[PDB]
């Protein structure tokens, strides 16, 4: 069975995620509205900016993260933010419509919408298949949040100084997860390895997105539609 | 009477302004919506960004401007943009409501709205009185656009290299204006000097706004709400 430290970690991560994920999606009206060249870019830029703020808020509540150096926190966030957004977005994703539904049909994004923000099927098809594969895993809340925290704490990001400590935190989390699946997830025998596979997938998605983003943000007429925060976080200026 | 060069200049400036000022204000729906800390800042940031794009489009069609060096064009724009926005905004201003009406009441901005984007009465009261004084001048279209072009071409901006040429263009415009008022504006005997006074007022408004903007943009939690273009243009990084 699980320990009270592991349990407290789970409770912390769940509370953190609840504090930074709004299931009402009521904030979305504050974004530059959707439009259907690159009509969806203002809206999706605002969406992603909002989401980065959320990921930061979540990371600050991961046990041990805000004990890391500001440099390490920044490096971990700049490397992982896009992956955590991809992960956390599964919660609004639907196997039925094969797309993300955040309230009304105004805030319902299919592949074409994201095409209208500069991206290609080389990213969007793998992204969608990742979403579907991940949704079919039917993770518990506890597992979802543990996976985000784990993704965030990978020490093999560029720019990371304290490899050993970061890897320590990450390991503690992985033990928490493996134990949780052992004791609490019936028929979850094969689950942990699948989740780890999903982290690898995220690395590939990150790679592709970073190329396409590099393409987009190199054109001033498109980058001007981005937000300051997006520009900072996805920027290369570390 | 006026000459065909002066007349062609007037025709050019009018066509330019018509091409860059949308009287329907139909683009406003694309902005982050208004809200009534600093609730109005996202909306007014988008409004101003949009407007800067417009001022740039207008300047590119001023006779002689796009023959200046990129450095001089940038310097003139960074120094004058806020003033041209203040000037061009008179077209939506109303003496009745003492505020700017751009279609529906959603896009109707009074002093309080602009207070909710970080500014104080030290700027807003002079700005409003400037708007009212300028509106009471009842300028012709031709005079309005000439005044914008003239404001844009002041060579006594910081960063300006080719003082003599810029001052030449500006002088030609001023002759165009003075003649226009002479021949075409009944009872406009005192008008030119009043308009020149309004340019001075704009300098004071610019001064105050630049201080308050410096204040705002120094706080990351507010500057993150600004747009890339706004940050560039009002930025000090020339």
């Amino acid at each position: 069975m699980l320990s009270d430290e592991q349990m407290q970690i789970i409770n912390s991560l769940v509370e953190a995620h609840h504090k930074t994920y709004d299931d009402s999606y009521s904030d979305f009206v504050r974004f530059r509205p959707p439009v259907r060249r690159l009509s969806m870019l203002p809206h999706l830029a605002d969406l992603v900016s909002y989401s980065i703020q959320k990921v930061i808020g979540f990371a600050k509540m991961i046990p041990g993260f805000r004990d890391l150096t500001a440099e390490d926190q920044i490096a971990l966030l700049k490397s992982s933010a896009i992956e955590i957004i991809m992960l956390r977005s599964n919660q609004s994703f639907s196997l039925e419509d094969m797309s993300w539904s955040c309230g009304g049909p105004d805030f319902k994004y299919c592949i074409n919408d994201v095409t209208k923000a500069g991206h290609t099927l080389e990213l969007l098809e793998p992204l969608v298949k990742f979403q579907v594969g991940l949704k079919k895993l039917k993770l518990h809340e506890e597992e979802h949040v543990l996976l985000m925290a784990i993704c965030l704490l990978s020490p093999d990001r560029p720019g990371v100084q304290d490899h050993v400590r970061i890897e320590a935190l990450q390991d503690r989390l992985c033990d928490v997860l493996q134990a949780y699946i052992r004791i609490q997830h019936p028929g979850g025998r094969l689950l942990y390895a699948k989740m780890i596979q999903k982290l690898a997938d995220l690395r590939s998605l990150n790679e592709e997105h970073s190329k396409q983003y590099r393409s987009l943000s190199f054109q001033p007429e498109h980058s001007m539609q981005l937000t300051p925060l997006v520009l900072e976080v996805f920027g290369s200026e570390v | 009477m006026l000459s065909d060069e002066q007349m062609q200049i007037i025709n050019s400036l009018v066509e330019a302004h018509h091409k860059t000022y949308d009287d329907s204000y139909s683009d406003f729906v694309r902005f982050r919506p208004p809200v009534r800390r600093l609730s109005m800042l996202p909306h007014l940031a988008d409004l101003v960004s949009y407007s800067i794009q417009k001022v740039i489009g207008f300047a590119k069609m001023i006779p002689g401007f796009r023959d200046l060096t990129a450095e001089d064009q940038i310097a003139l724009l960074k120094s004058s943009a806020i003033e041209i926005i203040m000037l061009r905004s008179n077209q939506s201003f109303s003496l009745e409501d003492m505020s700017w009406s751009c279609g529906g009441p959603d896009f109707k901005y009074c002093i309080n709205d602009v207070t909710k984007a970080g500014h104080t009465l030290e700027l807003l009261e002079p700005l409003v009185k400037f708007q009212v004084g300028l509106k009471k001048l009842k300028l012709h279209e031709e005079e309005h656009v000439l005044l914008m072009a003239i404001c844009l071409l002041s060579p006594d901006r910081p960063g300006v290299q080719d003082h003599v040429r810029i001052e030449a263009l500006q002088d030609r415009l001023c002759d165009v204006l003075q003649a226009y008022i002479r021949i075409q504006h009944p009872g406009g005997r005192l008008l030119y000097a009043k308009m020149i006074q309004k340019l001075a007022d704009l300098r004071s408004l610019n001064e105050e706004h630049s201080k308050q903007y410096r204040s705002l943009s120094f706080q990351p939690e507010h500057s993150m709400q600004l747009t890339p273009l706004v940050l560039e243009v009002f930025g000090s990084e020339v």
Binding site: K60, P228, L229 | -
Partner: peptide, 10 residues
């Protein structure tokens, strides 16, 4: 620089 990031990390 990372002004906004620093800020948001309190």
């Amino acid at each position: 620089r990372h002004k906004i990031l620093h800020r948001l990390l309190q």
